[PDB]
Amino acid sequence: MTEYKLVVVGADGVGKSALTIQLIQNHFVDEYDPTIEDSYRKQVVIDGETSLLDILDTAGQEEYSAMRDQYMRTGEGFLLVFAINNTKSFEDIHHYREQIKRVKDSEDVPMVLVGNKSDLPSRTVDTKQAQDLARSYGIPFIETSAKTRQGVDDAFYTLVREIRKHKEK
Ligand SMILES: CN1CCC[C@H]1COc1nc(N2C[C@H]3CC[C@@H](C2)N3)c2cnc(-c3cc(O)cc4ccccc34)c(F)c2n1
Ligand SMILES: CN1CCC[C@H]1COc1nc(N2C[C@H]3CC[C@@H](C2)N3)c2cnc(-c3cc(O)cc4ccccc34)c(F)c2n1
Numbered sequence: 001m002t003e004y005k006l007v008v009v010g011a012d013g014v015g016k017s018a019l020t021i022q023l024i025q026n027h028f029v030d031e032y033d034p035t036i037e038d039s040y041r042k043q044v045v046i047d048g049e050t051s052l053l054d055i056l057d058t059a060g061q062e063e064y065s066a067m068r069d070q071y072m073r074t075g076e077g078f079l080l081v082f083a084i085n086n087t088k089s090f091e092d093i094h095h096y097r098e099q100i101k102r103v104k105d106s107e108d109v110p111m112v113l114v115g116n117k118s119d120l121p122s123r124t125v126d127t128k129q130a131q132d133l134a135r136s137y138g139i140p141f142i143e144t145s146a147k148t149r150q151g152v153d154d155a156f157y158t159l160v161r162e163i164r165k166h167k168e169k
């Protein structure tokens with residue numbers, strides 16, 4: 001009966017929707033509407049536990065209404081997504097992590113840093129940069145390609161494992 005509320009955050013264009021749709025539908029959607037914030041639930045078995053993952057794929061205007069703080073605060077774990085070919089997207093990770101900490105009122109929120117578009121040759125964020133950042137935050141780092149599905153399950157399932165560890169602290 002276990003359910004996990006997950007939220008996928010990060011800059012426009014990093015592949016949040018492509019990652020979400022790989023998990024939900026098992027294919028690469030090349031051009032999912034860039035403006036649309038939507039959610040999807042999927043039943044999975046992770047380490048033998050049947051789970052319902054209820055995933056919010058964020059999008060749309062930058063706004064900070066009380067309603068948005070309220071529903072964002074119900075997230076139990078967050079994927080911090082950047083793209084390895086886009087330094088600006090990596091530089092935005094700090095902001096998303098701070099907004100999560102702000103609404104959850106905690107220094108300890110389950111998160112995973114996700115470096116997407118790992119299939120692309122035009123790398124401008126080194127793996128070491130991402131590892132150093134994740135280490136500084138105390139969280140895992142997972143390299144993904146929504147295009148090929150590399151790492152997708154690992155990113156979501158690692159986030160579930162982080163939530164489990166948080167629950168038992
Ligand atoms: C100049 N900007 C500040 C530096 C980085 C840059 C963009 O920042 C930014 N952009 C957004 N959008 C615009 C683009 C990018 C992604 C989506 C949505 N399309 C955000 C939307 N909601 C939230 C948020 C609102 C909230 O009430 C509570 C939150 C809790 C956790 C995480 C996010 C929350 C944000 F922080 C956004 N930040
Ligand atoms: C501009 N928006 C599009 C039209 C509506 C407007 C607001 O959007 C919006 N409002 C809500 N309200 C619930 C509470 C708090 C404020 C109001 C409205 N009463 C959401 C609730 N849950 C989720 C969600 C669903 C889900 O399946 C998985 C989630 C995982 C983590 C966090 C939230 C999740 C959402 F996305 C909500 N979004």
Ligand SMILES: Nc1nc2c(ncn2[C@@H]2O[C@H](COP(=O)(O)OP(=O)(O)O)[C@@H](O)[C@H]2O)c(=O)[nH]1
Pocket residue numbers: 010011012013014015016017018019029030031032033034116117118119120144145146147148
């Ligand atoms: N090569 C490559 N392209 C990707 C990958 N993920 C997303 N894209 C492309 O990057 C663009 C933005 O993806 P989208 O899922 O809309 O990003 P979002 O704005 O974060 O939801 C689209 O053109 C996608 O096809 C990936 O892992 N590899």
Ligand SMILES: [Mg+2]
Pocket residue numbers: 016017018032033034035036057058059
């Ligand atoms: Mg999207």
